[PDB]
């Protein structure tokens, strides 16, 4: 019910899985080394 979209650090592919605190398995490479791909876009001017 709680699905979060996560992005991978090693195979760089995203998987929409449930939010699992004990480990969200990337189905692409069997790795738990993942970030969240639901990163919110904020508008800020930076030079
Ligand atoms: Zn992966």
10: left (phi over 0), alpha (psi -120 to 50) or beta: alpha
Name the residue among 43, 41, 42, 40 with its Cα closest to residue 4.
40
Domain CATH code at residue 39: 2.20.28.10
- What is residue 11's DSSP assignment? S
Q: What experiment produced this structure? A: NMR
- Give distance in angstroms: CA of 23 to centre of ligand 1: 13
Total number of domains in the chain? 1
Q: Tokens for 44?
A: 């800020």
Distance CA 12, CA 34 (A): 9
- Give distance in angstroms: CA of 26 to centre of ligand 1: 5
Distance CA 25, CA 4 (A): 12
- Give distance in angstroms: CA of 14 to centre of ligand 1: 8
* Domain interval for residue 30: 1-47
Distance CA 32, CA 44 (A): 31
């Amino acid at each position: 019910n709680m699905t979060v979209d996560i992005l991978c650090n090693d195979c760089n592919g995203r998987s929409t899985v449930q939010f699992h605190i004990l480990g969200m398995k990337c189905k692409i490479c069997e790795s738990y080394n993942t970030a969240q791909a639901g990163g919110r876009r904020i508008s800020l001017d930076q030079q």
